[PDB]
């Protein structure tokens, strides 16, 4: 019984042991949202199991690329260095949008975010600050390695 409809279930199928998920929500608007959110969650674990490599989420990748590309534009940059320098500022909009939607400090939290990523590239003392992200529930840079914020 699936709340005034009929639904047929097959248990474990004796050959391959497949899986199916039946979602339960309040109305039909939540069930269409729960289906799209579950399908995007199935695509995350698919790419991790296929390509065994994960990056830290929460703006940790965009903070490290915002400072490495500024040093990359100074080495081999003669006339196209202004486009590489604006490529780093365009990548900073992903941690900038996390501070706007959280109603936190904007020009100080991202400035504190790239302060740890700058010391992880110019001070080779094994600082291990490559996984510094954002804690949007608190408003401070956190370590995404121990917090469990992983993206493919």
């Amino acid at each position: 019984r699936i709340c005034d409809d009929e639904l047929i279930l097959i248990k474990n199928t004796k050959a391959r042991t497949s899986a199916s998920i039946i979602l339960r929500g309040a109305n039909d608007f939540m069930c269409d949202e729960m289906e799209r959110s579950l399908h995007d969650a199935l695509c995350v674990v698919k790419r991790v199991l296929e390509s065994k490599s994960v990056v830290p989420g929460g703006g940790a990748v965009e903070a490290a690329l915002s400072i490495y590309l500024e040093n990359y534009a100074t080495s081999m940059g003669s006339r196209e260095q202004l486009a590489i320098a604006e490529f780093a500022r365009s990548l900073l909009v992903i941690p900038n949008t996390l501070a706007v939607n959280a109603a936190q400090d904007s020009t100080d939290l991202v400035a504190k975010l790239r302060a740890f990523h700058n010391e992880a590239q110019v001070n080779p003392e094994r600082k291990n600050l490559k996984w510094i992200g954002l804690d949007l529930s608190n408003g401070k840079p956190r370590d995404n390695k121990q917090a469990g914020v992983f993206e493919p």
Binding site: C3, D4, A26, N27, A103
Partner: protein, 526 residues
């Protein structure tokens, strides 16, 4: 005429505080419509249909389905009451008032520069603590007792319009579920919509309404020579026709001789007599099919003393197959002794108001029954039909989950003190929205005194003081008089599946409508 260089033509854009605080006022508007339809002192609400009909009811589900709204957040609240109507029976009006009150206290925290994800994360922590409180204050029910099950269904129909005929409607709704409780394989099921048909006939009195031990249909006999009163008939259910129809091919017969045309007209009569000889080998009395019966088939069943019914519906054939224990066959030459509906009781073709009705009643152990409703007109008989559907589904929840929650305000106050004592160990920014969920549950004892005209200050101060002690914990609001009576003495008890579905749907309605900060309207689709 040059076109204007625009983007996203003929659509609207709206964000900010006008959408967060705009969906709250749309939820408060629907909760004020059915606010006078919760207590036992409620009143009916006459509605008008676009077909020309009139729906005069006080049930919270039937009111919101007749309202066409244009607001997008108002369309979400109508689908909430449709979900509560299909899961449980009497779980409708309580969710719309509770979801409007949980969003009423949620609008206060949105003005305090608090993020909506903080209120939802406090709502999900509060939802997990409301389920554990109802399971501690529950009570096991003896489902084998008849007088114990009558007090549960009487508590659900005291709000409705059948509370005046409470001694009759409780015995009808209890016997309807216990007849259709069928179990063939190792799986218990109760189907009170496909097998418990509620038919209404205009005329007579409401006190003469009773649940028949069997089925009934509005069908006359095919021939007047057939019997209209059989003591113990052997009913054979058919699915195919007893006529001669064209095959599923391109058949064409070339007639060159003189004796060929008269032979085909004789082979059409011998084909009908062959399938009529195959159904009389088991010696039946009543032949019931879904398609037409030709007059050549009526002649062979007339001299064999067989009463034939012509055009019984497919849903009525599935209902009589459970009452008489017959098998709906679709081949007259493949009939067996197990396909004969033995054990059927008295069959009588009565007439109720210049129209014949085929009664198949007095069965030994029927697995499907038909509630015969007789009243003044079709207007009030649609009310009793909608109330018996809310009376049979609340008996289905007890037979699948025999636990009772003390209703009438005692359920909401027992959890609101449990959320208050558990909020002392929070010590965070989610402590204050956690307290508002316990204050949002106060709207259910608020409604029981606003409908009867009692005071909401002198009563709620005394009702909140009754739940300060852990011993009693079951004091509710008596909607009949207006004082505070314990629910162990009144007998108002609601099932566990009603109160769990009420709290799970009212929180998740506030979860969906608080994450909405933008609305786009004006685009088309396929």
């Amino acid at each position: 005429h040059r076109p204007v260089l625009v983007l996203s033509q003929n659509t609207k854009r709206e964000s900010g505080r006008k959408v967060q605080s705009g969906n709250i006022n749309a939820a408060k508007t629907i909760a004020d419509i059915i606010r006078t339809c919760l207590g036992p002192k409620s009143m009916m609400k006459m509605l008008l249909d676009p077909m020309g009909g009139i729906v005069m009811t006080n049930d919270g589900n039937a009111i919101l389905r007749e309202i066409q709204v244009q607001h997008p957040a108002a369309k979400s609240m109508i689908e909430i009451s449709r979900t509560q109507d299909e899961e449980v029976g009497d779980g409708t009006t309580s969710v719309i008032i509770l979801a409007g009150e949980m969003l009423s206290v949620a609008e206060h925290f949105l003005e305090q520069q608090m993020h909506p994800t903080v209120v939802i994360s406090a709502y999900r922590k509060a939802l997990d603590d409301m389920i554990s409180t109802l399971k501690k204050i529950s009570i096991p029910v003896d489902i084998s007792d008849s007088d114990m099950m009558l007090n549960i269904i009487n508590s659900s129909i005291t709000t409705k319009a059948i509370s005046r005929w409470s001694s009759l409607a409780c015995n009808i709704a209890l016997d309807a579920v216990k007849m259709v409780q069928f179990e063939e394989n190792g799986r218990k099921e109760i189907d009170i919509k496909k097998y418990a048909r509620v038919e209404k006939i205009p005329g007579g009195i409401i006190e003469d309404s009773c649940v028949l031990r069997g089925v009934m249909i509005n069908k006359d006999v095919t021939h007047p020579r057939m019997r209209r009163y059989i003591k113990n008939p052997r009913i054979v259910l058919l699915d195919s026709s007893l006529e001669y129809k064209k095959g599923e091919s391109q058949t064409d017969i070339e007639i060159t001789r003189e004796e060929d045309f008269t032979r085909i007209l004789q082979m059409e009569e011998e084909y009908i007599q062959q399938l009529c000889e195959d159904i009389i080998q088991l010696k039946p009395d009543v032949v019931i099919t879904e398609k037409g019966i030709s007059d050549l088939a009526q002649h062979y069943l007339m001299r064999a003393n067989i009463t034939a019914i012509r055009r019984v519906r497919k849903t009525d054939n599935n209902r009589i197959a459970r009452a008489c224990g017959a098998r709906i066959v679709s081949r007259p030459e493949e009939l067996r002794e197990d396909d004969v509906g033995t054990g059927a009781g008295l069959l009588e073709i009565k007439k109720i108001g210049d129209e014949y009705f085929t009664f198949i009643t007095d069965c030994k152990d029927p697995k499907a029954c038909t509630i015969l409703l007789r009243g003044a007109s079709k207007e009030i008989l649609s009310e009793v039909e909608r109330n018996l559907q809310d009376a049979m589904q609340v008996c289905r929840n007890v037979l699948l989950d025999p636990q009772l929650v003390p209703g009438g305000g005692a359920s909401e106050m027992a959890v609101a003190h449990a959320l208050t004592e558990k909020s002392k160990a929070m010590t965070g920014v989610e402590q204050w929205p956690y307290r508002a969920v316990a204050q949002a549950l106060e709207v259910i004892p608020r409604t029981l005194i606003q409908n009867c005209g009692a005071s909401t200050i002198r009563l709620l101060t005394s009702l909140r003081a009754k739940h300060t002690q852990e011993n009693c914990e079951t004091w509710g609001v008596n909607g009949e008089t207006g004082t505070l009576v314990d629910m162990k003495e009144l007998g108002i008890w609601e099932p566990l599946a009603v109160k769990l579905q009420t709290y799970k749907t009212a929180v998740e309605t506030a979860v969906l409508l608080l994450r909405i900060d933008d609305i786009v309207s004006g685009h088309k689709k396929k």
